[PDB]
């Protein structure tokens, strides 16, 4: 039964897209928020299809009403909620479902005061006795941004989705859009894809029953502590974290899932920023989190380093068997030039082992890696060499010289010698621990290859997730060679 | 109330709503609205922006100064007046006009040219969609079945918004019509 | 057992007639003179007559 729900939603959003190209992210987000009792906000220049989406989502139901009003600087509350006689609310907002409010950043003082009580309580102060408001979707569009110290920020902090629409840019999607024969006032939604009033009241209760996995909570709490340490990061209130869960739980509900999926965190890119300055900061932190700690991308990186450290620890103990012989070629030159091994080594960032460890830069080291593009220059022209320690940090300078027996003596602050050596051409203990970590990559990749059919996920985000999973898998297959 | 009578051709009336048989919406004024006001919502929705001015020619002013033609009679004959049935049928055949591939190369090029110029006015996506209905209607009443490249001349009064951008829109189209239209500069 | 709520937001252009109730003598049906627990957010921007 839950698997058949994702098919009906995919056919409902397909009929709503017919007529508005390059607006999939602006229509799918409004349909999910309407079925879960959430709001949505739009921003952009007037004329990028902002009022039609408010009149298009009403055809997906069976008892919805439209209300397209423009808030002016001299607007009165009696002209919005209907004039009083006790208030004639015949087709306005208290009895409507999907209302539209354009230029909301300039209404009267009493207009904004009545809108705050109709969101947290879904009621209205209609004279003496109050009544409920069957509001299913709240949308608002404008153009500019409010002040930093004003009363208009009370409503902006309560809206969940902050859509960022813009004009068309693609040429192929503009051909049929320029000459579109589809009417904007008909009923393109079939009668079989429209939900009833009974199914809406039942879905409002099953969303809260979605369980929260322990691995999902590790990503939400980490993002909150990350934005608090950055001064340029925008502040996120506690209400935004609670209202965002209802959106993620509703995305997995209409997609054939019973728990919160880690891929649902992509929708948080339009629920944290507030201006154009913080727009590039929210999309940057989530892109790193979705390609770092989502499917355990960086989690396997800190575990693979312990396997390499354990493998290199057993190779430096038996380094006396295979040393490092440098070829001789001192012909006619002012300095005894050297050269590395030919076909034996071909890597660029190869590592070199040492016998007796030394204390370089007030720390211990067990392996030093050099660059192939930088080793040929020092062994031919001379000068100084720069190499990092333990494969981390920057390429610090070392006191490396040539040996009489064709070796590499590393000098420190105590004038101590250390002959370098290269690792030869896998122990059973390292192979056993490596297969356990490699099997974890296939388990995390199998989860992404099953839930990628979510309709509420953009298409440009799948290119960065797949490129992040292949980068980790390409590094774990190099040490096993 | 004027915004709901354009996109939906309806008007609220207490309880039930009704349609408006509005065929032509004309508006005239003198000054320009503010840059940050609610009056810009109606200006961005109007298609044709006619720029009328006083007479300048001397030959056309002689008969105009002493004109005996009445302005309250019926100079239109009864044989040239269309009926209510022909109006409802013409509203459907306008959308059936095909869009040639050579015409699309000029509309998309004009949109990208105004975006690179900082002094050029901004044109929303609604204006590009509503302008096609005007060009397709010009070729419909002229004996054509497709969008004619010469119909782009009427775009000189559907892009500008003030007196500053009036000389910029009429200059870019004049070069486009005498450059990339019939492959002049091409 | 007989309390009433009143969530109001004070603005820089608020009027006293929109808080206590518009006059006809003042229609104070469910506001502040007959309420018990009222809420006032952003009180540091109200008008001079509201604070008085
Ligand atoms: N980007 C777009 N793609 C397709 N159609 C559009 C687009 N922008 C506007 N339209 C069309 O213009 C008409 C009017 O849009 P409108 O409500 O004025 O947009 P806005 O509310 O952003 O000003 C709509 O019926 C819509 O079909």
């Amino acid at each position: 039964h839950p698997h058949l729900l994702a098919e009906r939603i995919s056919r409902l959003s397909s009929s709503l897209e017919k007529g508005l190209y390059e607006r999939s992210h602006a229509i799918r987000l409004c349909l999910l928020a309407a079925l879960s009792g959430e709001s949505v906000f739009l921003l952009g220049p007037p004329g990028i299809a902002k009022s039609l989406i408010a009149r298009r989502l009403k055809f997906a139901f069976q008892n919805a009403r439209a209300f397209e009003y423009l808030m002016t600087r001299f607007s009165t509350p009696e002209e919005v909620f209907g004039p009083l006689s006790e208030r004639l609310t015949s087709g306005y907002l208290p009895e409507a479902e999907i209302v539209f409010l354009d230029e909301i950043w300039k209404a009267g003082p009493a207009i904004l005061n009545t809108l705050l009580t109709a969101i947290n309580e879904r009621q209205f102060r209609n004279g003496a006795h109050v009544e409920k408001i069957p509001m299913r979707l709240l949308v608002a569009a404008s153009n500019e941004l409010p002040e930093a110290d004003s009363s208009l920020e009370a409503l902006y902090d309560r809206m969940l989705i902050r859509l960022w629409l813009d004009k068309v840019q693609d040429k192929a999607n503009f051909r049929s859009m320029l000459t579109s024969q589809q009417d904007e006032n008909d009923n393109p939604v079939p009668d079989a894809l429209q939900v009833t009033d009974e199914e809406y009241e039942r879905w409002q209760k099953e969303i809260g029953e979605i369980t929260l996995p322990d691995h999902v909570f590790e990503l939400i709490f980490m993002l909150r502590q990350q934005l608090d340490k950055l001064p340029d990061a925008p502040y996120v209130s506690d209400r935004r974290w609670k209202k965002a869960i209802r959106l993620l739980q509703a995305s997995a509900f209409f997609s054939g899932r019973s728990a919160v999926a880690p891929v649902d965190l992509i929708l948080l890119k339009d629920c944290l920023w507030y201006d154009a300055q913080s727009l590039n900061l929210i999309q940057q932190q989530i892109d790193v989190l979705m390609t770092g700690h989502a499917w355990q991308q960086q989690g396997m990186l800190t575990r693979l380093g312990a396997i390499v450290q354990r493998h290199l620890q057993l190779q430096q103990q038996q380094s006396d068997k295979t040393a490092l012989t440098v070829i001789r070629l001192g012909g006619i030159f002012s300095r005894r030039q050297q050269y590395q091994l030919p076909v034996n080594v071909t890597a660029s960032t190869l590592t070199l082992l040492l016998q007796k460890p030394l204390k370089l830069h007030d720390m211990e080291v067990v392996h030093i890696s050099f660059e192939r593009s930088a080793l040929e220059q020092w062994l031919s022209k001379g000068g100084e060499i720069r190499g990092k320690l333990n494969g981390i940090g920057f390429a610090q300078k070392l006191n490396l010289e040539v040996d009489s027996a064709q070796h590499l003596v590393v000098r420190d602050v105590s004038l101590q010698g250390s002959t370098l050596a290269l690792p030869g051409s896998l122990p059973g203990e390292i192979k056993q621990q490596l297969e356990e970590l490699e099997s974890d990559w296939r388990k995390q990749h199998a989860l992404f290859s099953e839930q990628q059919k979510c309709l509420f996920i953009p298409g440009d985000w799948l290119g960065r997730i797949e490129a992040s999973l292949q980068d980790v898998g390409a590094q774990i297959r190099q040490a096993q060679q």
Side-chain angles (χ1 to χ4, degrees), chain A:
Chain A
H1 296 285
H3 294 88
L4 294 174
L5 184 63
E7 184 67 28
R8 189 259 183 86
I9 302 299
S10 179
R11 299 292 179 90
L12 182 62
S13 179
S14 179
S15 66
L16 296 173
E17 189 178 1
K18 293 180 181 179
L20 294 174
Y21 288 164
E22 293 181 354
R23 295 291 185 269
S24 66
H25 192 274
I27 298 169
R28 295 175 184 175
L29 269 298
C30 293
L31 180 62
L32 186 62
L35 295 175
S36 66
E38 293 293 328
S39 66
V40 65
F41 178 73
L42 277 75
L43 184 62
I48 55 172
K50 296 183 290 294
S51 66
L52 185 64
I53 51 96
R55 295 179 293 173
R56 185 65 61 84
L57 268 297
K58 68 181 182 180
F59 290 101
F61 290 163
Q62 293 180 357
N63 192 0
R65 293 179 181 177
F67 181 75
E68 183 178 1
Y69 186 78
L70 179 63
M71 291 294 172
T72 62
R73 292 181 180 177
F74 294 99
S75 296
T76 61
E78 294 293 328
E79 292 178 353
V80 177
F81 295 99
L84 79 159
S85 66
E86 65 183 1
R87 294 177 65 88
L88 294 175
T89 63
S90 178
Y92 289 100
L93 196 145
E95 69 179 2
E97 292 85 4
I98 296 95
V99 297
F100 181 74
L101 297 176
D102 194 1
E103 295 293 327
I104 202 67
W105 309 107
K106 63 181 72 174
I111 297 170
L112 196 271
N113 293 318
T114 60
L115 293 174
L116 293 175
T117 62
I119 296 170
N120 291 318
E121 292 180 353
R122 294 288 192 270
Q123 293 179 357
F124 184 74
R125 51 177 63 88
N126 193 0
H129 295 285
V130 298
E131 65 182 1
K132 60 100 176 179
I133 298 171
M135 183 179 72
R136 294 180 181 177
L137 183 63
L138 183 63
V139 65
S142 179
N143 193 1
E144 66 182 1
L145 293 173
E147 294 293 327
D149 291 331
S150 178
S151 296
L152 271 300
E153 293 180 353
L155 183 63
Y156 189 74
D157 290 331
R158 292 183 185 273
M159 291 185 285
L160 183 63
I161 300 168
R162 276 83 170 274
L163 291 177
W164 180 257
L165 276 74
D166 197 358
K167 63 183 181 293
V168 296
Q169 293 295 111
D170 187 74
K171 187 177 179 180
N173 290 318
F174 188 73
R175 179 67 181 271
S176 296
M177 178 266 173
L178 186 64
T179 61
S180 179
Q181 294 179 357
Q182 183 62 255
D183 190 359
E184 68 271 15
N185 290 318
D186 290 332
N187 204 165
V189 176
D191 291 331
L193 295 174
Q194 294 178 356
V195 299
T196 62
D197 291 331
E198 184 179 1
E199 293 179 353
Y200 182 75
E201 294 293 328
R202 188 178 65 246
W203 289 351
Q204 293 294 322
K205 191 256 182 65
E206 293 180 353
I207 293 170
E209 292 179 353
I210 299 300
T211 61
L212 197 273
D214 292 330
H215 188 274
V216 179
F217 184 74
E218 294 293 327
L219 294 175
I220 298 169
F221 182 75
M222 185 177 177
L223 185 63
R224 184 178 181 270
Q225 298 294 321
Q226 183 62 255
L227 295 174
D228 186 74
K229 291 177 70 68
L230 295 174
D232 291 331
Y235 181 76
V236 180
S237 66
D238 290 331
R239 183 178 62 246
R240 184 59 52 83
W241 293 104
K242 185 176 180 180
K243 290 176 71 175
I245 302 300
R246 191 175 179 87
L247 184 64
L248 271 72
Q249 288 180 354
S251 179
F253 179 75
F254 294 101
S255 296
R257 291 188 296 272
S258 66
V260 178
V263 75
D264 291 331
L265 276 76
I266 303 169
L267 295 175
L268 294 174
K269 68 181 179 67
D270 290 331
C271 295
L272 298 175
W273 62 271
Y274 69 98
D275 57 352
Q277 190 269 331
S278 66
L279 182 62
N280 290 318
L281 193 144
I282 300 299
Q283 293 179 356
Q284 185 177 2
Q285 295 293 322
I286 297 171
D287 191 359
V288 176
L289 184 63
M290 291 300 291
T291 60
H293 296 284
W295 287 272
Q296 295 298 109
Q297 291 87 14
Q298 191 178 2
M300 293 187 287
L301 294 174
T302 186
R303 293 179 66 188
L304 185 63
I307 299 169
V308 178
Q309 182 61 256
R310 184 66 178 171
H311 184 273
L312 292 174
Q313 185 177 2
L314 294 174
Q315 296 295 321
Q316 61 92 28
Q317 293 178 356
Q318 297 294 321
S319 66
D320 291 331
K321 181 63 66 68
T322 300
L324 193 145
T325 300
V326 181
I327 60 171
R328 186 179 294 275
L329 51 93
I332 305 300
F333 192 75
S334 179
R335 188 179 295 276
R336 292 180 181 177
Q337 292 180 355
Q338 302 299 322
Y339 189 71
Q340 69 272 16
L341 279 77
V343 78
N344 296 115
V345 287
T346 57
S348 66
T349 62
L350 78 159
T351 61
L352 294 174
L353 295 174
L354 77 160
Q355 283 73 241
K356 183 178 184 293
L358 295 175
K359 186 179 289 293
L360 294 173
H361 295 285
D362 197 74
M363 66 183 73
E364 58 92 20
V365 65
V366 297
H367 63 87
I368 299 169
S369 66
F370 284 162
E371 184 178 1
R372 187 259 182 87
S373 180
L375 185 63
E376 293 179 353
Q377 185 178 2
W378 182 66
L379 294 174
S380 296
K381 273 77 177 175
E384 293 179 353
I385 194 167
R386 294 177 65 88
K388 63 181 73 175
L389 294 174
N390 289 318
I392 61 170
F394 294 100
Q396 295 298 109
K397 293 182 183 293
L398 295 174
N399 193 0
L400 182 62
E401 65 183 1
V402 70
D403 196 0
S404 66
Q406 295 294 321
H407 292 288
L408 294 174
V409 176
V410 175
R411 298 292 180 90
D412 55 354
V413 298
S414 296
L415 294 174
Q416 297 294 321
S418 179
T419 300
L420 293 175
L422 76 159
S425 66
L426 183 62
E429 184 178 1
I430 304 299
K431 186 177 184 293
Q432 183 66 41
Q433 293 179 356
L434 185 62
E435 292 180 353
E436 293 179 353
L437 184 63
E438 186 178 1
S439 178
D440 291 331
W441 179 64
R442 293 182 184 271
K443 292 181 181 180
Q444 296 294 321
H445 187 273
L447 294 174
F448 182 74
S449 66
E450 185 178 1
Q451 66 184 358
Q452 77 275 18
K453 56 99 176 179
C454 182
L455 190 66
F456 300 102
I457 298 298
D460 55 355
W461 285 96
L462 275 75
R464 278 84 60 85
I465 301 299
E466 184 68 28
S468 66
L469 294 174
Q470 295 294 321
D471 196 2
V472 178
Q475 186 176 3
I476 196 167
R477 291 180 181 177
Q478 185 178 2
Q480 66 182 358
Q481 297 294 321

